[PDB]
Amino acid sequence: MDWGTLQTILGRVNKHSTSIGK
């Protein structure tokens, strides 16, 4: 779900997890 009635708002895009530690 996105916006009161939309879509182009959030898509879990743009992120970084290459960082090591786990």
From Swiss-Prot:
Subunit note: A hemichannel or connexon is composed of a hexamer of connexins. A functional gap junction is formed by the apposition of two hemichannels. Interacts with CNST. Forms heteromeric channels with GJB4.
Ranges facing Cytoplasmic side: 14-20
This protein's name: Gap junction beta-2 protein
Regions that enter the bilayer but do not cross it: 2-13
Location(s), subcellular: Cell membrane; Cell junction, Gap junction
Similarity field: Belongs to the connexin family. Beta-type (group I) subfamily.
Cited function: Structural component of gap junctions. Gap junctions are dodecameric channels that connect the cytoplasm of adjoining cells. They are formed by the docking of two hexameric hemichannels, one from each cell membrane. Small molecules and ions diffuse from one cell to a neighboring cell via the central pore.
Highest taxon, organism lineage: Eukaryota
Clinical note on disease: Deafness, autosomal recessive, 1A: A form of non-syndromic sensorineural hearing loss. Sensorineural deafness results from damage to the neural receptors of the inner ear, the nerve pathways to the brain, or the area of the brain that receives sound information.
